[PDB]
Design a binder for these strands. Structure first.
Ligand SMILES: [Mg+2]
Ligand SMILES: [Mg+2]
Ligand SMILES: [Mg+2]
Ligand SMILES: [Mg+2]
Ligand SMILES: [Mg+2]
Ligand SMILES: [Mg+2]
Ligand SMILES: [Mg+2]
Ligand SMILES: [Mg+2]
Ligand SMILES: [Mg+2]
Ligand SMILES: [Mg+2]
Ligand SMILES: [Mg+2]
Ligand SMILES: [Mg+2]
Ligand SMILES: [Mg+2]
Length: 157
RNA sequence: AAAUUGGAGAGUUUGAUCCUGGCUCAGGGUGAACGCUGGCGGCGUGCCUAAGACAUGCAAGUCGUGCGGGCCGCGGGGUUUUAC
């Protein structure tokens, strides 16, 4: 029970003697606007069917974004193939200043203020993935402190 | 140049795809010009070209408490032919 978004829809061709033969691809985001978002890419031979598919997939591929007051805990830059996303967190009332794709993903995550640039290939699908991977990677003076102290944590805390 | 105050992309090579890569667009700006249209005010601002040629008018004068005198006169005096 999340909101869904359409990143993008495309049509694609095979070949058989006597014609092209088509298939559809849907890129779908799914969020609960409070720190959980999932991305799904589904292909079927019919467009709405593909989206259904896509939506199913999205919910299985879910990522808990640690939102820190409308924004993300530190800056971060992530490459995926040719494509590369940068996420710089921002102050209140800044807005999601991000491209076409990352926005949709960020918005449904529950993010409200954040800085962004795409870089390298701009391909939707990889930018989609680079963003989801970027968010999959964020940590906290908390998340981090446990990793480093860790090996005797709870002596100082 | 004292809240980390700040960063959006899209179209286009293929039957489709990923990359490379160039082309192109949306933004902001002007000592602007051109089209269509044009009610009022305030503040700015107006030869970017031939540093080409220039009619006319004005654009640096002032001091008589530094000094003598020409011209046109006003008074007021002394005085050898009523001129000095
Ligand atoms: Mg986490
Ligand atoms: Mg690379
Ligand atoms: Mg902050
Ligand atoms: Mg490129
Ligand atoms: Mg491009
Ligand atoms: Mg070729
Ligand atoms: Mg074609
Ligand atoms: Mg303009
Ligand atoms: Mg007119
Ligand atoms: Mg001239
Ligand atoms: Mg000139
Ligand atoms: Mg002259
Ligand atoms: Mg004197």
């Amino acid at each position: 029970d999340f909101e869904e978004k359409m990143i993008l829809i495309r049509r694609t061709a095979r070949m058989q003697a006597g014609g092209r033969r088509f298939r559809f691809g849907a890129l779908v985001v799914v969020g609960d606007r409070q720190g959980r978002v999932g991305l799904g890419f589904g292909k079927a031979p019919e467009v709405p069917l593909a989206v259904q598919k896509a939506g199913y997939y999205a919910r299985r591929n879910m990522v808990e974004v640690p939102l820190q007051n409308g924004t993300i805990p530190h800056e971060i830059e992530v490459e995926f193939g040719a494509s590369k996303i940068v996420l710089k967190p921002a102050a209140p009332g800044t807005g999601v200043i991000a491209g076409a794709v990352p926005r949709a993903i960020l918005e449904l995550a529950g993010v409200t203020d954040i800085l962004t640039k795409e870089l390298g290939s701009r391909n939707p699908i990889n930018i989609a993935y680079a963003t989801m991977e970027a968010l999959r990677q964020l940590r906290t003076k908390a998340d981090v402190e446990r990793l480093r102290k860790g090996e005797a944590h709870a002596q100082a805390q």
